[PDB]
Amino acid sequence: TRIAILGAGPSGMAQLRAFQSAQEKGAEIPELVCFEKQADWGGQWNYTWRTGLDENGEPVHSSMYRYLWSNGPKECLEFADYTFDEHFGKPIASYPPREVLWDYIKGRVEKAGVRKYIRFNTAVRHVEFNEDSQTFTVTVQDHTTDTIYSEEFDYVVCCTGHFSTPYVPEFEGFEKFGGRILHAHDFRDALEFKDKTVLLVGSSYSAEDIGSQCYKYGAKKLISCYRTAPMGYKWPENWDERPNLVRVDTENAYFADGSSEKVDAIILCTGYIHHFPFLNDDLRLVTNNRLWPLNLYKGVVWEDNPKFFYIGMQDQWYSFNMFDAQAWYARDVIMGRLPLPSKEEMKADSMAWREKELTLVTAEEMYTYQGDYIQNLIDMTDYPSFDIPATNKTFLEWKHHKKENIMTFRDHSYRSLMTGTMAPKHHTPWIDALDDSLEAYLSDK
Amino acid sequence: ATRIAILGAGPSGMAQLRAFQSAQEKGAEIPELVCFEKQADWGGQWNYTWRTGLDENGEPVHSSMYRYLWSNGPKECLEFADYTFDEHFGKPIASYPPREVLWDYIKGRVEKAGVRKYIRFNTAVRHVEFNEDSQTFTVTVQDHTTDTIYSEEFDYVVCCTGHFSTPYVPEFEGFEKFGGRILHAHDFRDALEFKDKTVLLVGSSYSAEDIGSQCYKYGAKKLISCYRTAPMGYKWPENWDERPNLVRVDTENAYFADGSSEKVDAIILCTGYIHHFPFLNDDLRLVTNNRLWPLNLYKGVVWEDNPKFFYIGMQDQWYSFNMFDAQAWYARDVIMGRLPLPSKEEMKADSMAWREKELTLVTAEEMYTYQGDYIQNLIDMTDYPSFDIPATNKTFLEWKHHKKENIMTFRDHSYRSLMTGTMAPKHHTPWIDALDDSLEAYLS
Ligand SMILES: Cc1cc2nc3c(=O)[nH]c(=O)nc-3n(C[C@H](O)[C@H](O)[C@H](O)COP(=O)(O)OP(=O)(O)OC[C@H]3O[C@@H](n4cnc5c(N)ncnc54)[C@H](O)[C@@H]3O)c2cc1C
Numbered sequence: 001t002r003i004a005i006l007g008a009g010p011s012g013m014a015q016l017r018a019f020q021s022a023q024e025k026g027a028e029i030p031e032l033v034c035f036e037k038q039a040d041w042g043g044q045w046n047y048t049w050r051t052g053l054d055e056n057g058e059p060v061h062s063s064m065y066r067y068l069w070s071n072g073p074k075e076c077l078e079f080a081d082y083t084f085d086e087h088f089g090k091p092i093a094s095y096p097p098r099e100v101l102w103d104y105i106k107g108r109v110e111k112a113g114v115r116k117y118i119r120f121n122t123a124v125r126h127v128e129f130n131e132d133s134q135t136f137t138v139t140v141q142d143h144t145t146d147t148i149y150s151e152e153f154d155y156v157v158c159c160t161g162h163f164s165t166p167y168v169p170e171f172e173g174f175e176k177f178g179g180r181i182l183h184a185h186d187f188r189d190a191l192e193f194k195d196k197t198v199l200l201v202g203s204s205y206s207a208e209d210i211g212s213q214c215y216k217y218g219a220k221k222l223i224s225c226y227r228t229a230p231m232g233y234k235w236p237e238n239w240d241e242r243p244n245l246v247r248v249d250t251e252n253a254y255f256a257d258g259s260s261e262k263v264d265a266i267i268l269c270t271g272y273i274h275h276f277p278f279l280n281d282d283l284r285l286v287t288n289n290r291l292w293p294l295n296l297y298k299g300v301v302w303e304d305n306p307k308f309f310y311i312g313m314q315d316q317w318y319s320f321n322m323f324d325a326q327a328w329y330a331r332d333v334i335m336g337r338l339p340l341p342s343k344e345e346m347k348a349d350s351m352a353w354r355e356k357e358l359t360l361v362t363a364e365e366m367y368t369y370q371g372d373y374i375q376n377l378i379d380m381t382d383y384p385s386f387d388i389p390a391t392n393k394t395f396l397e398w399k400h401h402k403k404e405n406i407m408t409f410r411d412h413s414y415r416s417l418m419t420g421t422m423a424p425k426h427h428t429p430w431i432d433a434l435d436d437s438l439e440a441y442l443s444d445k
Numbered sequence: 446a447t448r449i450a451i452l453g454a455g456p457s458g459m460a461q462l463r464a465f466q467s468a469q470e471k472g473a474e475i476p477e478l479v480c481f482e483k484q485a486d487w488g489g490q491w492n493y494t495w496r497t498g499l500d501e502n503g504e505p506v507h508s509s510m511y512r513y514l515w516s517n518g519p520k521e522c523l524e525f526a527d528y529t530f531d532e533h534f535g536k537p538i539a540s541y542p543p544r545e546v547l548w549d550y551i552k553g554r555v556e557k558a559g560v561r562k563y564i565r566f567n568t569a570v571r572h573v574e575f576n577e578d579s580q581t582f583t584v585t586v587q588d589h590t591t592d593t594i595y596s597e598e599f600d601y602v603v604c605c606t607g608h609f610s611t612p613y614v615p616e617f618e619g620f621e622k623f624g625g626r627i628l629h630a631h632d633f634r635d636a637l638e639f640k641d642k643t644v645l646l647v648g649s650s651y652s653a654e655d656i657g658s659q660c661y662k663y664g665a666k667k668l669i670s671c672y673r674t675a676p677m678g679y680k681w682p683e684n685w686d687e688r689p690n691l692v693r694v695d696t697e698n699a700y701f702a703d704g705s706s707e708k709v710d711a712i713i714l715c716t717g718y719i720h721h722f723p724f725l726n727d728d729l730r731l732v733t734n735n736r737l738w739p740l741n742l743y744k745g746v747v748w749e750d751n752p753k754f755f756y757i758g759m760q761d762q763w764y765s766f767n768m769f770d771a772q773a774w775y776a777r778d779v780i781m782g783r784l785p786l787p788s789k790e791e792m793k794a795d796s797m798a799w800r801e802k803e804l805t806l807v808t809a810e811e812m813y814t815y816q817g818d819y820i821q822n823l824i825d826m827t828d829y830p831s832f833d834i835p836a837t838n839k840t841f842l843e844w845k846h847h848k849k850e851n852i853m854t855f856r857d858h859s860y861r862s863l864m865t866g867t868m869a870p871k872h873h874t875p876w877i878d879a880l881d882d883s884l885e886a887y888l889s
């Protein structure tokens with residue numbers, strides 16, 4: 001049995017780990033080949049100065065930027081099989097910088113010894129299902145040797161992400177704007193916008209955080225405009241909210257009310273698309289970003305072809321723990337431990353899940369929904385169970401601290417749901433901690 | 446019937462369509478034509494976009510053209526032999542028109558030809574496979590309008606997807622730490638973003654000098670050109686320094702191979718491009734550095750391992766539009782059985798001879814004269830209007846001289862059309878002062 005894993009981000013790392021964990025217990029695991037286009041694993045977490053296209057002409061993958069910290073409480077991502085105490089030995093504050101979180105992430109994955117399965121600097125060019133042999137043709141470009149080769153596989157797990165191919169809407173006047181226009185995906189360094197007025201369009205994943213990085217690092221003025229429901233956050237004195245953008249000229253933005261302001265740069269925080277150029281329509285997932293995409297049994301299995309799998313393709317309220325559950329589930333399906341219903345029943349099961357999804361209004365409902373999804377997957381495998389209700393509860397006190405004050409939510413502390421450890425206060429308040437580094441974070445004063 | 450896939454509708458793809466249309470106008474039986482273009486409109490590089498990185502559909506942005514771009518060489522060197530500047534603009538214009546004017550020109554030709562009807566816009570080529578059992582090509586494509594992936598069968602394929610879009614972007618020590626903007630020439634859009642800033646231009650590829658000129662003209666505080674290559678020869682303005690290669694950067698500063706250090710606000714990597722065809726496997730895929738004579742191409746056009754596959758405009762460009770034409774006419778007549786191909790071994794041999802001659806090229810004059818001879822060879826074989834290549838070369842000579850005189854005024858010079866003999870009038874505004882790059886201001 002021969003399996004292909006597209007991508008060495010957290011999802012592909014989870015899949016590898018799922019298989020190593022089955023084997024470490026004593027089962028005989030299929031051969032694993034994980035193709036990764038970057039020079040090293042980590043996916044989104046592997047930060048790069050590069051933007052647009054990479055050294056090989058491949059789309060730059062990572063959207064992460066300098067000075068980024070944990071989006072939510074670290075206790076909400078803490079791995080179900082590997083604790084923050086286990087890895088660091090010391091208690092730490094609740095919103096670690098990217099570097100810190102990365103060290104934690106690789107700590108688990110290298111203790112697992114799964115690196116041996118990965119082909120780096122190798123981009124999946126095509127995946128094709130052979131009707132006659134019930135096998136897959138995966139065509140790959142190796143950028144080290146510069147050769148395009150293909151090899152056959154029995155199962156394929158797609159772990160290539162959905163936060164890398166930008167949705168970039170055009171607004172009337174864009175060709176003439178004398179300032180810089182970039183998608184959030186291209187944002188690297190908040191110092192570039194020091195003393196400048198930045199217009200921030202949209203309300204997708206990084207809109208609120210990108211703004212607050214610019215603010216913290218000395219932007220002159222921020223303007224947020226968006227089309228979704230206004231979160232009543234108290235913004236700082238030089239942060240302005242306007243109705244949606246309609247047009248721009250050489251140096252000005254014009255909003256729906258009829259007001260205008262001088263704008264030095266425009267960051268489109270307008271989201272991403274599910275994009276799989278290596279896929280034909282018989283295998284290609286088409287969906288907007290949501291809690292419940294169609295055509296995926298248990299949110300993981302490609303319904304038109306049970307031999308193909310997708311990890312991490314849902315909108316991510318939960319992240320790392322969800323990828324694990326999804327991976328473990330997919331592993332047990334591939335290995336023959338869990339038999340799949342018929343296409344008809346899979347489709348109908350997914351419909352019940354969609355119908356549930358359409359019902360959700362509040363943030364609490366949305367976590368509970370995703371928590372229940374993960375609980376469902378965990379129940380079917382030997383994945384260790386974790387305190388989902390209390391994790392939901394923690395997510396919700398994070399949303400609460402955001403509402404109280406959007407600029408200081410990162411100085412709050414939370415109780416670990418793996419070890420019960422209350423996180424200590426960080427030595428430096430967020431606003432003042434300009435230093436991005438692990439070495440800064442781990443030390444004192 | 447016979448059907449042909451044309452990949453890309455830049456100058457080259459437009460030209461191929463024009464080649465077939467002209468044969469039909471002369472009364473020939475034309476194969477069925479299908480042209481795939483990932484952008485919304487034709488023009489290739491010349492279709493300007495504000496976008497960088499990835500386009501509205503998640504496809505890599507193709508154009509590397511920036512605001513305020515004017516023709517690098519005299520327009521007299523790129524005039525179509527069958528579609529004249531006089532015919533198009535109805536009147537004499539200066540010799541270095543801005544982008545939109547040249548964009549207006551090139552589409553003016555194919556609008557008249559009525560070839561828009563063969564083109565499928567907003568459609569990205571995903572894969573091309575040759576089928577041995579069928580002697581035919583499967584072209585898999587993504588229509589971003591319908592959001593569907595399909596595949597059609599073709600007897601011949603002509604690849605016109607360009608080779609100046611996928612950048613080569615080297616790392617220098619400290620790039621992760623650098624506090625300012627780092628971009629490739631490919632991403633460069635508007636010189637204004639650099640008003641009052643110190644800009645480092647790394648390398649000496651095609652656009653190094655011109656990007657620096659834009660920044661200078663639109664008010665950059667200081668420019669620094671650094672490169673490993675031999676000195677360019679140009680005396681720059683007062684606020685522009687040359688340096689040997691970059692070595693490393695810190696938070697604010699760049700460090701050079703001569704022990705020098707300078708604070709820089711932005712680094713522009715002018716390091717060129719790679720030939721990149723993610724839709725081809727090793728059997729069909731041209732692999733080469735940018736040069737006057739790539740290998741594996743008979744007459745610079747015919748893929749030798751599969752003579753049913755063709756490439757237009759894949760060589761480095763002294764000539765541009767005339768060349769794509771000669772190439773498009775040549776590939777037309779091969780497709781239409783008008784020019785049978787010699788053996789594979791014989792094809793490799795003609796290629797070697799053109800390669801060995803290329804290795805002997807030792808001056809700029811020799812290089813464009815070489816390309817001129819290559820074009821003359823292609824044109825001798827077809828009904829493409831012959832035009833005075835030797836006189837075109839002398840126009841290149843005159844242009845290189847003008848650059849050597851004063852690099853900031855070379856665009857203020859006029860030249861005689863080798864097609865109509867029209868003498869380009871002096872433009873109403875010197876380049877340094879013509880801040881407005883529009884077609885309306887230009888033709889006023
Ligand atoms: C700005 C930003 C901040 C975030 N912050 C947090 C946070 O604080 N906490 C949190 O829990 N989550 C955060 N996330 C969510 C993030 O999506 C997940 O943490 C996680 O990275 C998802 O992992 P993934 O493997 O599914 O996708 P990715 O991490 O994106 O990895 C996909 C991998 O597939 C590879 N790949 C793609 N195409 C190909 C190809 N054709 N061939 C070969 N390889 C390919 C890529 O190189 C990449 O390594 C953030 C996301 C963004 C964009």
Ligand SMILES: Cc1cc2nc3c(=O)[nH]c(=O)nc-3n(C[C@H](O)[C@H](O)[C@H](O)COP(=O)(O)OP(=O)(O)OC[C@H]3O[C@@H](n4cnc5c(N)ncnc54)[C@H](O)[C@@H]3O)c2cc1C
Pocket residue numbers: 452453454455456457458481482483484488489490491507509510511515516517518523568569570571605606607608609610652724757758762764765766769
């Ligand atoms: C910055 C810059 C400045 C230049 N200035 C001049 C100048 O002043 N004078 C001059 O004579 N020449 C200039 N050139 C040279 C230029 O290469 C030619 O003028 C000309 O544009 C080449 O035409 P082409 O059709 O061969 O390639 P392109 O113009 O690049 O067109 C290729 C086409 O293929 C399409 N395409 C690519 N891949 C796919 C795919 N996968 N699926 C569907 N479609 C695809 C693209 O969208 C594009 O339309 C310049 C080039 C650059 C980069």
